[PDB]
Amino acid sequence: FGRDYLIPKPFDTRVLLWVAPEVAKAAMKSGVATRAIEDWDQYRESLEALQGPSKVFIRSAINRVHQNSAANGGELPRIVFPEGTSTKVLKALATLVEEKICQPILLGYPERVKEKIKALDIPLLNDVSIVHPSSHPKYFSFVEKLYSLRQRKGINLGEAERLMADPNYFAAMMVNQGEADGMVSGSSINYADAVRPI
Amino acid sequence: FGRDYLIPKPFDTRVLLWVAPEVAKAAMKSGVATRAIEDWDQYRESLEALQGPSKVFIRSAINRVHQNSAANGGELPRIVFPEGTSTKVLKALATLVEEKICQPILLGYPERVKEKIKALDIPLLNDVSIVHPSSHPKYFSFVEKLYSLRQRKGINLGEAERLMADPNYFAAMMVNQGEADGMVSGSSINYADAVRPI
Ligand SMILES: CC(=O)SCCNC(=O)CCNC(=O)[C@H](O)C(C)(C)COP(=O)(O)OP(=O)(O)OC[C@H]1O[C@@H](n2cnc3c(N)ncnc32)[C@H](O)[C@@H]1OP(=O)(O)O
Fold first, then answer.
1. Is A98 part of the contact surface with chain B (CB cutoff 8 Å)?
2. CATH for A56-198, among 3.20.20.150, 3.40.50.10950, 1.20.120.530, 3.40.50.300?
3. Phi, psi of B135 (to 5 degrees)
4. Nearest CA to ligand 1 atom 45
5. B190 CA to middle of ligand 1, Å?
6. Could you tell me which chain A residue has the CA closest to the CA of B109?
7. Which residues contact B194 (CB under 8 A, 6 or more apart)?
8. Which residues fall in a coiled-coil region (chains A, B) (predicted)?
9. Domain residue spans in chain B?
10. B52-to-A14, A138, B101 alpha-carbon distances in Å
11. Looking at residue A5, what DSSP letter applies?
């Protein structure tokens, strides 16, 4: 509660629970009610039934994301998308960035993704970070890490370098190494291939 | 036999088989021999034994490549190397190009492989074709081919597109489609991974 929180949020499931009964109370107290409510707990049960998960679960999730970011000085989670040119992904990110759900980082050749974004006419993404794995400054430290993790599992430095050039691997490593808070993939390839580097 | 072939080539392996027994014969007929050769078949065999594969096999292969070339107007086989930045591959390519064995096509980001070539100082490769798979004119044509080849083996257009950006897949496709006459890979990754796209 404060200067940046003066009223409930619209996606707050409690407004109904709090407000509808006080309105009920005021209607009866003013005598304009024709049906008295006696059991108020039972009444709130009746109100919650009206607010089930098919209506409110996602709404509440989003709210919670917002409470989390707000309670952390407002930073949004950094989420990497290895499929930077995926039409579905970019279009979703429009919605997503506009509503402060995360700070996306896209992977791919910058010129080619700025191009797909312009072709699809999504202007909300002109600020988004775009990273090409091989030319990322932390690339070689990443390959060292993958190497050390899998040197006795068929992956030496040459091969680690090769894999780390793949966005799926780069993303997984960013998340692992804390250069990202999470990642989302598989919009454009089969699950096994997308999940394996994770 | 003709105006451009009046004698054996210096490295003709038949020369000993042909000349040495006639010299022996002449030595005997002229009376300067002190040990007569009786079984000539046995002698010619003994001479065959003196120039075995450890002495001539690769020499003969290389000559055979050259005269193959000559019979097609000096055409060299186009061989693609997906590991355009392998120091072993480049160093060997120095010899190979210098000795007219093939016409190499390197795969990778042209800037980084030219950096490598300059770093290792192989000046005979300033002329070598360097191709970045995704930005080659026949790239999408290739992707289509791969798609139609394995659409019922877990590869639809999206994934075909992703794979065909891999130098190994690109090289294999070049050889398949006749844009290159052969390919050599596996210098810097394990065999399974190198051979699988082939
Ligand atoms: C120089 C050296 O040191 S080699 C050292 C050790 N040797 C090795 O590690 C290779 C051991 N062999 C292997 O790992 C596997 O057999 C591989 C790499 C050859 C390929 O097999 P997998 O990894 O299982 O992939 P997969 O088999 O699904 O793809 C191979 C393709 O070639 C075909 N293929 C592979 N092996 C064969 C085979 N013996 N006979 C006929 N077809 C084959 C497959 O049918 C498949 O093609 P398709 O799916 O379109 O029909």
1. no
2. 3.40.50.10950
3. -105, 15
4. B196
5. 13
6. A134
7. B168, B185, B186
8. none
9. 56-198
10. 93, 55, 23
11. B
